[PDB]
Design a protein around this nucleic acid. Structure first.
Ligand SMILES: *C1O[C@@H]2[C@H](O)[C@@H](COP(=O)(O)OP(=O)(O)OC[C@H]3O[C@@H](n4cnc5c(N)ncnc54)[C@H](O)[C@@H]3O)O[C@@H]2S1
Ligand SMILES: [Zn+2]
Lengths: 83, 93, 95, 105, 289, 93, 112, 78, 100
DNA sequence: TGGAGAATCCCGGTGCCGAGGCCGCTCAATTGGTCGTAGACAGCTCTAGCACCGCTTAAACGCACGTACGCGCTGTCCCCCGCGTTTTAACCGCCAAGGGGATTACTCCCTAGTCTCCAGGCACGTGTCAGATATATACAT
DNA sequence: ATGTATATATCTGACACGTGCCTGGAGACTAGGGAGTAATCCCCTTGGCGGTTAAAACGCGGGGGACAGCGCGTACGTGCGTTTAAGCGGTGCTAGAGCTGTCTACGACCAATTGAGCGGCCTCGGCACCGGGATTCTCCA
C-alpha cells in the first residue's frame, strides 16, 4: 500500500522516446536521472495543487477537474478534460 | 443533473465552414474547453477594465477593449470587426 | 547494420509523427499515487485525472527536452548533458 | 426572430452568454450589448480554429477532426499560437520539426 | 595559534622587522608605572586597548616583534608556534582587566587581538570592541546575530562556515536561516559598524586611555588613543617596541605588560582572578566599591 | 480628492517590529502596492475556489485554501497560523 | 449605542478589518462575503507586510541606515527564497539587482 | 531617435547584469529587444488610456499594462 | 577605515560590475529615453500626453527587463565556454524564455 | 559512379464502436411592463504637461595600441548507439465489493440591507530633526 | 609658508507629529435563503486473476564526437583628449483631469408564456486492422 521508489518506473527507453519526440539526436547517460528528478518535481507541484483543491472541496477523490485547475493555476492550462 | 456544453454551436459552425467534415468527441471537448477559456479571459479583462475606471456595468465598450487587449493584431482586428457587426445587426432589429 | 546516428533520426521522425502517450501508463500511475501519498493519505484518483497528469507531464518534458537540445546545439555539441537541462530550467525561471 | 441569437447574425447562444456574464460575478450590471459582442467573438474564434483544423484534416486524408488536427492548426498559425501559447492539447502531439544541423551531411 | 599573515592576504606591506626590544631600567619603570597608577586612580573615564602583545605571554606569537610571525615570514622562513586557541591559557592581564571592569574603574575596552581571550575571560561583551574580530564568534549574515562558540569556527575572510542561524523572532515571523559567517577582517575590509562606533564614543569620552600590547601601526585601532588625547586627555603607551605615535605619547614604558600591570595592581591594592575555560558572559557586571 | 492607502497600518506594523527605523515615501508606496497585489491575488483565488464548489460566499476556509495555493514554503504555513489565530480571537470576542 | 470598538481591536490585528471587508464586498468577488473572511485576509496581509518590513529593517541595518529605501526592500525580497518565489514577477522600482558575479568571470590570483 | 540609447548605456546595463565582455554586435540586438518590449508595453498602456477617454497616458495605465503582461511594477501606486 | 600605469584588461570591467550592481539609479539618460517613448507611442495615437511618472515607470520596467535579459545572456555565454556575450546568446536566452 | 535492403508509401476487403439523427419534453430563454440610479452630457477650474532658453559640465564620441580571447585544427579515448537474446511486467479481458460522489428534504443559522451615531482616517501646516556641504582652523611637511 | 585634513556650523529637505473636518465604519435590527445535515442510491474505483507478449534489460563491439591542447588573427578594453547635448533652474501658457450639477435612458426585477437543447432511443459508416505491391535513403563497393 505504501508505494516506494516508483520513479524508476520511468525507464531509459521512455525518457529516450520523450527526447526523440523533442528532437534530440544523442542523449548522455547522465540525462536520465536528471529527467527523472525534473519529472518528480513537476508532479509534486501539480499533485500538491490538485490535493489542495480536492481537500478544500471536502472530497476524497482527485477528480480530473482538480488536475485541470492545478495546471491552470501554474500557467499550463490543459484542454480535453473539462474547464 | 444535465450539464452545459457548446457542442451544438461548435457543430453548427463546423458545418457552416466545413460542410463535409466531422469531429471526434475528444476534439469537441477540447473545443468546449477552449471556448470556456477564451470567454473567461475576455470577461475577466472586461471586468478589470470596468473596475479600473470605477464603472459598474460591462458594456460593449469594455468587451471591445478586452478583446483588443487579449488577441494579437489580426485576430483582434477581425474579432472586433465581427463584434461590431453583430451589435449593429442586433440593435438595429 | 546501420552506422550509428542514422536510426536516431528515424526514431525522431516516428515519435514526432505519432501522438500516443510515450510513458507506460501503469508505472506513471504508481508514481502519481506514490507522490500523492506524501500530501494526503488514501486518495482515489479518477482515471481521467491520471490521464491528465500524464499528458501534462509528457508535454512538459517534451518542451523541456526541445529547449535542452537548443541549448546543447548552441554549445557546439550534438549530445545533451545535464548542464543543458539546468541552463534551460534556469533561463525559464524554474528552480 | 424570438431568440436574441437569431436577431443577431450569430450561431452561438447569446442568452447563455448573458446568463454566464450575470452569474459569473464580473460586474453588478451587464450591458444588453455585451452578450452579443462576446458571442460574436467566440463564434469567430471557433470558426477560425475549426477552419484551420478542417484544412489540416483534409490535408491528412481524414474526413473528421481529431485532437492532432487541432494541435497542428493551433501551432502552424502564428496568431493563434501566440494566443494559445500556454495551452497543451491532450493527444495533440508535437509539431514535426528537426534541427538544421542534426540532418545527415 | 594559526597566523593571520597568510590568512589575511598575500599583500603585506609591514616594512617593520628591525625592532630593538628596548627594556626600561627597573627603577625608571617603577617610577613610570607609579605615575601611571597615580593618574589612573583618579581618572574617571578609562578605556583600555589590548593588542597582540598581551597574548604573547599566553604563548601565541606576536606579529611585528623579533618573534613576530610577519617578521619571520619576511626574513627567511621559520614560523614557530606552541599553543592553540582552544588550549590558549588566558594571560593574567585578561583577568586583571576583568577585575578593573568589575570595580568600575575600567570604563571600556577596545581590543584588536583575534584569539578572543578577553571574551573567554568573562569580560562583558557589551563593553568590548573586537574591531578585527574573534574566532569564537560567528555572526549571522542576514540578521547580524552573533553566536559565541567554544570551538573555533575555522574560516577566514568573512565567509560562510556551514551552519545556519538558529534564532527565532516574534509574531510568527519565520526563524532565520543565516549563513553564520566568521568575524576576521581581511586587508581592505570594513570594520564592525556599532562596535567601532562604541569604541569611538568610549575613546572620545576617555580622559585617560592606556594602550597595551599593540604597535598601533594598524588602521583606526591604533588611532583611537590619538582621539583619546585630542579634545583633552592623556595617552599612556605601554609597549616594548617604538610605537607609531611615541612622539604624541604622553607616557611610555619599556617592559613586560604583565609585570607593569601587576605593579599597577599592587600599588592600587587590587587583586586578579585566575582564568577559566570559555566562561563567556555578556551583560555588564554591576560595579563594585 | 480622497485617496485610500494602507500607509498608516504599514507604518504601525513597522514600528511594532522595528521600534527605531523609518521608511521612505517610495518604500511606503512599494509596500502599499505589495499589499494591494497580494490582496487581489488571494481574493481572486478565493473567488475561483468558491465558484468551483458552486458556493456563493467567501469564508475563512476559502481564504485559507487560497493562501495555501499562493504562498509557498513556510510562508504559507505561518500565514495560515496567523490567520487562524486572528479568526479564533475575533470569534471568541 | 455602546462604545464603537473596531473589529481590528477585537481581532488583535493592526490592519483594518472593516476596510478589507468593504473591499471584498465592493470588489465583486462573490454574491456574499463571510464574517470571518476579512479577518483572515487582513491577518495574512499583515503577516506578509511584517515579514517584508522585518527583512528590510535587517537589510537597512546591514547597509548602515536608519530609514528603509526601495533598495532595502529589493535586498530583503531577493535574499529570501520564499519571497523571491512569491514576488518572482515583480520589479521593485529603484531596487537594483543583487551583487552577483559569476566565478568564471573572477580573475585568477596566486600571482608573483 | 532609437540611437539615443548609447553604447555606454548598454554597457552599464550589462555591467549591472553581470557581463564582463561585450561583443560589438550586442548593441543593435539590445536596441531591438528594447524596442519590442517598449512597443508591447506602450500598446497596452495606450489601449488602456483610449478606453478611459483620456488624452494623457497616466502612470497607472503603464502599471496596468505591465501587470497584464506579467510584469507587475511596484512603487507607482495601484 | 578598512584593514590596511595600465591595468590588465579585465579588472576595470570587474570594478564597473561591482560599482553598478551596488547602486540603484537608472542607467539610461532620461531625456533620450523619453524621446524614444514618445516616438514609439507616436505610431499608435497622435498628440498623446505622458505623465512624468508614466515615463519613469516605463524606464524602470525596461531597465529591469534588460538587466534580467543580460543576466541570462551572460549565463548562456558562460555555458558555451566563453566570456564575451554575443547576439546568439541573447537570441538563445529569449528563445528559451518563450519570447522568441 | 554502381547494387542489395530495412523501412516506408500505397492498393484492395472490410466490420465494429463511435459519429450522427429522432424525438418527448421541462426547465431556461423570451416578451411586456415598472422603477430606481448609474452613467451621459455640460460647466468650471486650476494641476500639471508642455515649450523654450542659458549656463554647467558630466558624459558621449573618436582614435591608438596591445593583449586576452575567440576560433580553428588535430589527436586521444570513452562513452554512447545499434543489434540480438533473456526476461520482466505491462496490457487486456473479465469479474466483485463497496466506498464515496450525486441528488433530495428540513431547516436554521448567517449575511444582505437600513438606519443612526461618531471616532478613525485624511489634507494640510508646521516645526523639528537629521544630513550634507562649506568654511575655517590646526597640524604637518 | 602652504597645503590638506578634520571638525563644526548652518542651511535645506524630508518627515513625524499635531490639528480640524468629515464620512465611512460600528451597533442594533430584521428578513429570508445558502448551505448544513441526514438519508438514500448506485457509478466508478480498487482489487484480483490469468494469458499472450510488447517492451525493457543486459551484454558486446565499434566508431563518433567530447574534450583537451596548441597556435594565429583581431576585436575589445583601456586610456586620452575633444564634443555635445543631458541636467538644472527659471518663466510662461494652456490642454484637459478632476470635480460638480442635472436628468434620462437603461439595467434589474417580476409575471406570464413557450420552445429548444438534453437524455435516452436506434442506424449506419471511417478507418483501424489485415493481406500484398511498389518505392526511398543507408550502407556498402
Ligand atoms: C589584523 O589583525 C591584527 C591585530 O588586530 C593587530 C596585531 O598587531 P598589534 O596588536 O596592533 O601590534 P603588535 O604587533 O601586537 O605590537 C605589540 C608589540 O609588543 C611586543 N610585545 C610582545 N609581548 C609584549 C608584552 N608582554 N608587553 C609589551 N610588548 C610586548 C610585540 O613584540 C610587538 O612588537 O593588528 C593586526 S592586523
Ligand atoms: Zn539569523
Amino acid at each position: 500500500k505504501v508505494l516506494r521508489d516508483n520513479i524508476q518506473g520511468i525507464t531509459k527507453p521512455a525518457i529516450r522516446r520523450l527526447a526523440r519526440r523533442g528532437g534530440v539526436k544523442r542523449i548522455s547517460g547522465l540525462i536520465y536521472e536528471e529527467t527523472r528528478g525534473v519529472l518528480k518535481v513537476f508532479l509534486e507541484n501539480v499533485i500538491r495543487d490538485a490535493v489542495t483543491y480536492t481537500e478544500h472541496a471536502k472530497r476524497k477523490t482527485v477528480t480530473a477537474m482538480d488536475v485541470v485547475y492545478a495546471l491552470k493555476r501554474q500557467g499550463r492550462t490543459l484542454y480535453g478534460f473539462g474547464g | 443533473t444535465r450539464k452545459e456544453s457548446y457542442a451544438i454551436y461548435v457543430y453548427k459552425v463546423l458545418k457552416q465552414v466545413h460542410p463535409d467534415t466531422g469531429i471526434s468527441s475528444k476534439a469537441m471537448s477540447i473545443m468546449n474547453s477552449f471556448v470556456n477559456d477564451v470567454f473567461e479571459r475576455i470577461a475577466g479583462e472586461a471586468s478589470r477594465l470596468a473596475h479600473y475606471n470605477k464603472r459598474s456595468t460591462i458594456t460593449s465598450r469594455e468587451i471591445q477593449t478586452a478583446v483588443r487587449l487579449l488577441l494579437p493584431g489580426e485576430l483582434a482586428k477581425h474579432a472586433v470587426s465581427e463584434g461590431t457587426k453583430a451589435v449593429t445587426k442586433y440593435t438595429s432589429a | 547494420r546501420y552506422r550509428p546516428g542514422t536510426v536516431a533520426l528515424r526514431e525522431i521522425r516516428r515519435y514526432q509523427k505519432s501522438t500516443e502517450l510515450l510513458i507506460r501508463k501503469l508505472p506513471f500511475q504508481r508514481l502519481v499515487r506514490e507522490i500523492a501519498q506524501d500530501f494526503k493519505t488514501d486518495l482515489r484518483f479518477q482515471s481521467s485525472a491520471v490521464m491528465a497528469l500524464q499528458e501534462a507531464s509528457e508535454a512538459y518534458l517534451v518542451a523541456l527536452f526541445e529547449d535542452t537540445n537548443l541549448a546543447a546545439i548552441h554549445a557546439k555539441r550534438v549530445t545533451i548533458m545535464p548542464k543543458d537541462i539546468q541552463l534551460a530550467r534556469r533561463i525559464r525561471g524554474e528552480r | 426572430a424570438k431568440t436574441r441569437s437569431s436577431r443577431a447574425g450569430l450561431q452561438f447562444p447569446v442568452g447563455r452568454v448573458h446568463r454566464l456574464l450575470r452569474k459569473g460575478n464580473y460586474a453588478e450590471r451587464v450591458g444588453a450589448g455585451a452578450p452579443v459582442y462576446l458571442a460574436a467573438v467566440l463564434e469567430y474564434l471557433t470558426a477560425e480554429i475549426l477552419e484551420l483544423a478542417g484544412n489540416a484534416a483534409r490535408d491528412n486524408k481524414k474526413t473528421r477532426i481529431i485532437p492532432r488536427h487541432l494541435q497542428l492548426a493551433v501551432r502552424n498559425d502564428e496568431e493563434l499560437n501566440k494566443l494559445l501559447g500556454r495551452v497543451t492539447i491532450a493527444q495533440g502531439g508535437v509539431l514535426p520539426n528537426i534541427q538544421s544541423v542534426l540532418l545527415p551531411k | 595559534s594559526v597566523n593571520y599573515a597568510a590568512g589575511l592576504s598575500p599583500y603585506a606591506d609591514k616594512g617593520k622587522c628591525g625592532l630593538p626590544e628596548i627594556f626600561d631600567p627597573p627603577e625608571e619603570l617603577e617610577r613610570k608605572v607609579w605615575e601611571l597608577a597615580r593618574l589612573v586612580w583618579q581618572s574617571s573615564s578609562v578605556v583600555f586597548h589590548t593588542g597582540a602583545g598581551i597574548s604573547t605571554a599566553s604563548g601565541i606569537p606576536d606579529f611585528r616583534g623579533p618573534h613576530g610571525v610577519w617578521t619571520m615570514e619576511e626574513r627567511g622562513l621559520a614560523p614557530k608556534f606552541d599553543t592553540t586557541f582552544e588550549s590558549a591559557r588566558p594571560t593574567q592581564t585578561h583577568m586583571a582587566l576583568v577585575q578593573l571592569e568589575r570595580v568600575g574603574l575600567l570604563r571600556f575596552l577596545v581590543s584588536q587581538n583575534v584569539d578572543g581571550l578577553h571574551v573567554r575571560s568573562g569580560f562583558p561583551r557589551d563593553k568590548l570592541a573586537e574591531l578585527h574580530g574573534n574566532m569564537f564568534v560567528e555572526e549571522c549574515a542576514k540578521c547580524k546575530t552573533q553566536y559565541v562558540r567554544d570551538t573555533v569556527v575555522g574560516t577566514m575572510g568573512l565567509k560562510a562556515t556551514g551552519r545556519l542561524c538558529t534564532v527565532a523572532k516574534a509574531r510568527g515571523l519565520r526563524a532565520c536561516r543565516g549563513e553564520l559567517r566568521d568575524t576576521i577582517l581581511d586587508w581592505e575590509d570594513s570594520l564592525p559598524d556599532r562596535d567601532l562606533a562604541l569604541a569611538d564614543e568610549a575613546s572620545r569620552n576617555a580622559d585617560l586611555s592606556i594602550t597595551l600590547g599593540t604597535s598601533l601601526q594598524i588602521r583606526p585601532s591604533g588611532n583611537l588613543p590619538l582621539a583619546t588625547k585630542r579634545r583633552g586627555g592623556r595617552l599612556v603607551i605601554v609597549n616594548l617596541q617604538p610605537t607609531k605615535h611615541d612622539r604624541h605619547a604622553d607616557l611610555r614604558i619599556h617592559g613586560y605588560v604583565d609585570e607593569v600591570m601587576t605593579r599597577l595592581m599592587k600599588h592600587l591594592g587590587l587583586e586578579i582572578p585566575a582564568w577559566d575555560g570559555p566562561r563567556v558572559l555578556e551583560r555588564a557586571l554591576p560595579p563594585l566599591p
